[PDB]
Amino acid sequence: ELVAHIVRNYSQIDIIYDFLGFNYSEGYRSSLRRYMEYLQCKTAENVRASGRLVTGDKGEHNILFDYCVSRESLVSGDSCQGIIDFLYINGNDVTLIIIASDNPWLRNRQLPHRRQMEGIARRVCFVLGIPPSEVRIRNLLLPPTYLDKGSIVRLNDIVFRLSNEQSNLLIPWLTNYNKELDPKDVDYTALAKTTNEEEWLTL
């Protein structure tokens, strides 16, 4: 009876379950994509989705693009600095969402460089005709196996530009979704602090 009630009511209990870090088979990447697409669908008003690319309107520049899978893409014996999971552009702002890999010796190759960020911004300007003046990229780092409540609220704040009350109204369970960063990993806490405290690289 209780599981029947759970499935009936909590339509994204799977997203909550994967966000909490319970899923050891695939992690939370797919559920994160589904959550982000869900918010994109409720933030836009004419949304067309495809395999790896979801777009809203042609004027608002509301695009989600799941580039690849960082965990499998990252080989441990190669030297490349740019490997990102999702790329979301909202109006004139661009964000790169990367799930920090559990390997501290690969997190550094996972975080893209400043000049690569500049190139991404320049390509975005070329393709979508947005002037170089108001193109600005934010790099976003996330925990490897779960999400923090702070992480989710920040993801909503910068990727979708919706406040805390707006977020809790839009999704009921975020209000009491209580998760903290595991203190056993200080490397991720510091790296995420730095990356999220960075400013918008604007060119």
């Binding site: 009936r8 009511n9 909590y10 009921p172 369970w173």
Partner: peptide, 29 residues
């Protein structure tokens, strides 16, 4: 309460639709 109340209150599969989903017409065949 919000979840409970939000749970309470709230084509043709022919040949042509398949062909047009695929982006081809019978004439081009």
């Amino acid at each position: 309460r919000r979840l409970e109340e939000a749970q309470t209150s709230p084509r043709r599969r022919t040949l042509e639709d398949v062909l047009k989903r695929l982006g081809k017409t019978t004439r081009d065949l």
